[PDB]
Design a protein around this ligand. Sequence first.
Ligand SMILES: CN(C)c1ccc(N(Cc2cc(Cl)cs2)C(=O)Cc2cncc3cccc(O)c23)cc1
Ligand SMILES: CN(C)c1ccc(N(Cc2cc(Cl)cs2)C(=O)Cc2cncc3cccc(O)c23)cc1
Lengths: 300, 306
Amino acid sequence: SGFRKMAFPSGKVEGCMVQVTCGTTTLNGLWLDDVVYCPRHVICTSEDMLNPNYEDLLIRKSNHNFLVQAGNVQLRVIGHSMQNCVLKLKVDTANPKTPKYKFVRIQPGQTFSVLACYNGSPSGVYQCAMRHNFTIKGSFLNGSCGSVGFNIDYDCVSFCYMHHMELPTGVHAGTDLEGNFYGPFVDRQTAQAAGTDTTITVNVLAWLYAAVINGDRWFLNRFTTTLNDFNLVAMKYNYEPLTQDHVDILGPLSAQTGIAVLDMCASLKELLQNGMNGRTILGSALLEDEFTPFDVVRQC
Amino acid sequence: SGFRKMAFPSGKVEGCMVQVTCGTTTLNGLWLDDVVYCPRHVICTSEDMLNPNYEDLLIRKSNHNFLVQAGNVQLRVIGHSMQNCVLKLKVDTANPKTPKYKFVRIQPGQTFSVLACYNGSPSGVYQCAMRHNFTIKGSFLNGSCGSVGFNIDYDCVSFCYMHHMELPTGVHAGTDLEGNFYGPFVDRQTAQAAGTDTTITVNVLAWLYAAVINGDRWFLNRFTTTLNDFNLVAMKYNYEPLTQDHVDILGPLSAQTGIAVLDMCASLKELLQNGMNGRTILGSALLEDEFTPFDVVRQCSGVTFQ
Ligand SMILES: CN(C)c1ccc(N(Cc2cc(Cl)cs2)C(=O)Cc2cncc3cccc(O)c23)cc1
Ligand SMILES: CN(C)c1ccc(N(Cc2cc(Cl)cs2)C(=O)Cc2cncc3cccc(O)c23)cc1
């Protein structure tokens, strides 16, 4: 039984974490084969941060400017090029602990594990998901830039997030492992604000199905709804409109529990329309949208 | 900024995880040096677990009736011994991935990461607190037996938990890597139930302390309280009575954030006598007692681990 906000075994990612130092700026890097990936604003300073010209600032750099320390070893960088907002660094030695890896770009609502690191050494691991405003809510302090999000399915590790900045609202933004920012954000200190965050409707329903598996059924009702009726209620509560694709992906859980997906929407509709009543679902007194349908099946 | 349920990096632990197979039963082991640790109920069949005779099922076993495997590699068993509810298995090859480790037993209210393993392969890591009925609100299925709980201090691992059973309330309990059970539990299949629980007060205060640091400060009030005044209300609401040493542990937080402990105990006392009134603290509709003060220090200072 049981259900928890469980993350992935971080061991693969820890063996790839290095500490990149450029000038007086020190952030973590990700050492994969002969390349060390890190946010390109490592070459930037606060003065340049407003509207930096990275290509201009990069050609003014040489390999003797970049200090990479994988524990007690200084790494001989032999190449510096850019790829969007991710800075890549060629080195003479491939990382011995490099796992089978792949670079992916996730869609909003997808969950991934984050290895929070400071000065190249891991500090902790937690589970995050990509909000629909293209931000994440993880715990990050200054110097955590370069920490990565990932998802280990099979031996292969799917890198999908690199941490770059924290927004004024406290949420965090980043890029895929190719430097493309999630959302409209750019690697500049200029005023950027996060769009209003909608609740993940599909993940809450998947989380509910997990509860039924574990035995909680108080939220269930005899009602059902048409899909159009439910999304009209959902946006009233700042929820995400639910696609037919979302219904199809919730089918696998529907079969195992016997509850129709739209039948489960009615329980969600009543739950929003009434409240938690003090009772809890899986120990949570709120509705958890950080569990994709895949997460529910994998753990249950 | 931001607050998350964060666990220790599992990498040191993953390199100790092995599978153990005795007879028909397969479960997880922990390979440290030339000895692997697994719960002693591996030798048991479901028929035998009704009335087990653990001493006698040992000597019947031979040194080749334990199929231990580290990935595809298969380890060669030298000898076996039982230490309480934990079975120790000597093997020919000492583990080259053995980290700086030590066996610790945590007191209730302590938190620790629990790497979840199935068939000797790590599957997930999550943070658990030792509840005061001595159980764990964790996620476990069949084959999860042998998963261990641990803490990382400096570069030293602290193995503190081993998972054996699942109670019928959906909670879990086990031992302290020396076979010594946590709470009134035995490793047999005969009618064990989880005792009534009390909220960990000190981990609630630290959690509220975190809310202040990450902006959320609605709950603060001008008043202050006193241990005896507060604790009297605490027993009524099935809360832990707050002791002297609890405040000293929370002392660093009160200094770093600037509001007094007994001032903050007041914000809890009013909260536990008025409800949250629809407000959410760090976006949670209920109080969280699964964050020790050292846990939030680890997250508000970013203590790295080598
Ligand atoms: C000059 N330099 C090294 C530098 C480094 C980081 C930043 N920024 C601002 C921007 C980054 C980008 Cl990209 C566009 S603006 C950061 O946001 C850093 C940061 C990252 N994660 C968590 C944090 C938590 C608290 C405070 C922080 O500063 C945090 C600015 C300049
Ligand atoms: C025969 N054998 C190896 C065996 C191993 C474990 C058990 N038990 C029952 C007892 C364990 C102890 Cl100690 C005293 S009774 C377990 O509880 C195992 C278990 C653990 N966690 C999650 C589970 C989820 C579903 C089903 C499970 O069986 C789960 C019974 C027999």
